[PDB]
């Protein structure tokens, strides 16, 4: 059981040593501070009242896109440098490799959620207004976990199949940013707009990306079952392909 703990341990160290992590934190903090200052200096409110939905959504989107880049980079590091063949010796190693990578993804997600929580706390402490509730931060953490797990497993599968990296980065950016852009023109499609809009509530990509902007994590029962099922199917398929693929 040494290989699983050692792989997760070294990715966290790699995160804590690079300066780009603290450059991303400074950039994110600067953008939220500019947005907060713009909202506070508005001429409608003489009491300096701030609503927290806009800061929540903006910080969530920026921090999510940074966390997405951090998980894809951690996933494709070994395939970029070609050191992966040292990690592909036995079967127990191929399974401990996938389990440890998933565990690392989970650790990255919890840390990023905690950072978002702390940052929102300091913004609320600085300003004045109506504080939020604990269930909101917890449910935000669950949404972070679900999103990052799903996308990390999908990109892990693509990087296993292709063993490259420029496509992986472009593909991740393509799935996150094309759908909000594409959604308004879907209605203009002749007689199939209503069908695609109803069916987008069951396609995991569509509603996860739509719900990315949203300040609440309200989920239906069907949505929860299908998301969990997709996670389990992806994990099982990854385990089977890593134990049956020849390099």
């Amino acid at each position: 059981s040494h290989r699983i703990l050692n792989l997760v341990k070294y990715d966290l160290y790699s995160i804590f040593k690079s300066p780009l992590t603290y450059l991303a934190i400074l950039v994110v903090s600067s953008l939220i501070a500019t947005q907060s200052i713009l909202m506070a200096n508005s001429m409608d409110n003489p009491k300096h009242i701030i609503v927290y939905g806009s800061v929540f959504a903006a910080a969530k989107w920026l921090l999510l896109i940074i966390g997405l880049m951090f998980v894809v980079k951690t996933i494709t590091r070994d395939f970029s440098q070609g050191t992966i063949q040292l990690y592909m010796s036995k079967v127990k190693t191929r399974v401990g490799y996938i389990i440890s990578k998933t565990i690392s993804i989970i650790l990255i997600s919890i840390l990023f959620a905690l950072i978002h929580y702390v940052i929102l706390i300091v913004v609320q402490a600085s300003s004045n207004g109506k504080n939020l509730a604990f269930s909101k931060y917890v449910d935000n953490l669950w949404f972070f976990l679900i999103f990052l797990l799903f996308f990390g497993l999908f990109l892990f599968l693509i990087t296993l199949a292709s063993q490259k990296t420029a496509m992986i980065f472009s593909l991740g950016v393509f799935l996150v940013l094309i759908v909000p852009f594409i959604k308004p023109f879907i209605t203009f499609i002749p007689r199939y707009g209503e069908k695609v809009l109803d069916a987008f509530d069951y396609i995991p990509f569509a509603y996860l990306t739509d719900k990315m902007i949203s300040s609440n994590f309200d989920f239906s029962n069907w949505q929860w079952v299908i998301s969990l099922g997709s996670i389990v199917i992806f994990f099982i398929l990854n385990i089977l392909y890593v134990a049956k693929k020849d390099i």
Partner: protein
């Protein structure tokens, strides 16, 4: 570690064809062949990258494997000590300071052990990669071209150091390197790969060396001398392309020169010398292309 009836194929093309292999009372074994004959495929099969090989491989789960393949694999951005620490923790049972220190002192990377690997050269990276292979504490250590871009002095020193490591640790070595004259310095047995199967298996233990006599002459005369030596003595090997005829060690040259003089045909070059792997290599594999 045993291999039984391995036959690996890629579509219609066949790469490996019903080989057998076994480490029998030998510590250093060399694997020799051309490019794209299945040397890297065999090495990948041995190391463990291929599972759909359709055969039976006898390996133990309690036994670890440390390997070196085609190119060094390292974290280029970070440092060397970080690489050693990471692969000792991730692959071995833990980190041993005295053991790693002994390996570092014998190989010699201490002056440059604290500088980033991206600033290293090829020989330094290759030596460090060899150290990564010993980091696993293997029972079997297999290296694919450990001396690719390194000078003769460095290669002789590195192979001698590896030989000195073979008695403190219980090691069985497979080396699939080219430049066979460095291999005869340190090797116990050599295997030759042609058309997938292992055709010949030469084992050398003591210095008897099976002394031989080399006679060199042009092809138009090589046929008649070949006829004479087959009618007179018993012959072990012949090389048509170089006009090299390799009979056993002959103490007296009198009967050969009187007969070839009465034959009026004459040889270009005659010697008796200790055998090597070069004659066997050329004999087995000059046949497919020339």
């Amino acid at each position: 570690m045993k291999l039984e009836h391995i036959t690996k194929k890629y579509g219609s093309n066949v790469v490996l064809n019903d080989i057998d292999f076994d480490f029998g009372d030998s510590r250093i074994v060399g694997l020799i062949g051309k490019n794209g004959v299945g040397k890297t495929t065999v090495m990948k099969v041995m190391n463990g990258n291929i599972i759909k090989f359709d055969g039976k491989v006898d390996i133990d789960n309690a036994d670890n494997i440390g390997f070196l393949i085609e190119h060094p694999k390292l974290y280029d951005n970070k440092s060397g000590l970080y690489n050693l620490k990471l692969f000792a923790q991730v692959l071995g049972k833990g980190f041993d300071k005295a053991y790693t220190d002994k390996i570092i002192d014998a190989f010699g990377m201490r002056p440059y052990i604290k500088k980033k690997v991206k600033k290293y050269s090829m020989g330094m990276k290759q030596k460090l990669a060899i150290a990564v292979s010993l980091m696993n504490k293997p029972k079997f250590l297999i290296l694919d071209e450990p001396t690719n871009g390194m000078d003769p002095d460095g290669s002789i020193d590195v192979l001698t150091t590896i030989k000195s490591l073979v008695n403190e640790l219980d090691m069985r070595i497979l080396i699939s390197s080219h430049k066979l004259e460095d291999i005869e310095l340190i090797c116990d047995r050599a295997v030759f790969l042609r058309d997938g199967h292992f055709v010949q298996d030469v084992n050398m233990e003591e210095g008897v060396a099976s002394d031989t006599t080399i006679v060199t002459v042009d092809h138009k005369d090589f046929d008649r001398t070949e006829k004479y030596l087959a009618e007179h003595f018993q012959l072990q090997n012949v090389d048509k392309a170089d006009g090299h005829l390799m009979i056993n060690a002959q103490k007296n040259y009198q009967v050969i020169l009187k007969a070839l003089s009465e034959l009026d045909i004459y040889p270009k070059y005659i010697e008796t010398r200790k055998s090597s792997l070069r004659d066997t290599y050329f004999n087995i594999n000059q046949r497919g292309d020339k």
